[PDB]
Amino acid sequence: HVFARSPALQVLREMKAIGIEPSLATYHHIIRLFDQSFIIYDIMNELMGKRFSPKDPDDDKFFQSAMSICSSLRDLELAYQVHGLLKTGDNWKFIGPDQHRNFYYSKFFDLICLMEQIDVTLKWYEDLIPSAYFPHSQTMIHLLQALDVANRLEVIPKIWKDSK
Amino acid sequence: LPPRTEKMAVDQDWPSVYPVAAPFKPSAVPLPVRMGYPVKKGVPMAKEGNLELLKIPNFLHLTPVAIKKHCEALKDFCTEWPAALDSDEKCEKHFPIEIDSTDYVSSGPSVRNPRARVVVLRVKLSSLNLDDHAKKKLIKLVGERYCKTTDVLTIKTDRCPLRRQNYDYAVYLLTVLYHESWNTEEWEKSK
């Protein structure tokens, strides 16, 4: 926990200096150590545009953890940055098993519904569901709350038909 | 559950719905197409449950939009025909020899076809360095492989199992025929 933050950052600096490149597992470990939180901005800033290959068993746990942070911070630009990293090249293969995929996507879509304009929320709703994942009832409640906030109450029938 | 053709927009990207060759799915193809010989005072059968539409090798995965998108992405693999060769008149001048070989695409667990080993070499004798005696001897040696009307010597090799071996044998046959046409034995004078 908190006693470890500076030693872990020091270890990351050592690994960079020695010429051993970090992997998704390293950033996953650092993020989950700090989350118990602005290091994620720099981690993303370094990761933007890069393509990765499987180097550690824990690599697949990065995106989930990263997405978790974006939900707790309620920072939507960071969520878009993480998703754009996921979409670059063959990055999607690191989304992990179905449980991890559903966790990642549920937190992502909850954040979109909470912070984004309603029409872009509907575009993401149609693009992500059901092709990417099957929603949880909490996501439907969040989407209805978003529609209530945006005062687009003409859409509840379609949402209920979808939930059915 | 309701078919997903109800959720498809009228300006969607159809190539993504049928990326590859797949059998007709009535719940995926958003067309009210009908097939069947109608009964008396009847209508051709609907798509849902139709086995006849299920027996067609449909081209839903190759639409003009999809064909153009595929052929735009496949341009990167191509090389350019050398501009110097404008017609056959120059192709037969710079490349005298022609090698015909055939491949066969059937459907089955096995790809082997015995007819794919045959190789055919075609060369015009006027494109070889032969004098009068050499040309006469070459014609008499080859026999019916040579056609006088076209001036073309055709060597068809199928002895070897493989196609590369037959091509090598055809080249060897041409070489030995040329060199023995350019040789004069004792019995030659007995013409």
Partner: protein, 69 residues
């Protein structure tokens, strides 16, 4: 025939790998015997039948395992 024609033919038959030494009709059967794969070694002959043991005992195993009716 002729001396010239005979020698020319006996040389063309050496270039193309035919019978150079003179031979008769009965003896040319050996060439056909060894050029073609014999009928008993053709895949239409020795594999004319489906196995019928693989096919029948596979049903027996499948039904015993309860995966086939």
């Amino acid at each position: 025939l002729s001396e010239y024609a005979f020698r020319m033919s006996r040389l063309s038959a050496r270039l193309f790998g035919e019978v150079t030494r003179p031979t008769n009709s009965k003896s040319m059967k050996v060439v056909k015997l060894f050029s073609e794969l014999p009928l008993a070694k053709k895949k239409e002959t020795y594999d004319w039948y489906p196995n019928h043991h693989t096919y029948a005992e596979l049903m027996q195993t499948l039904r015993f395992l309860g995966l086939y009716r």
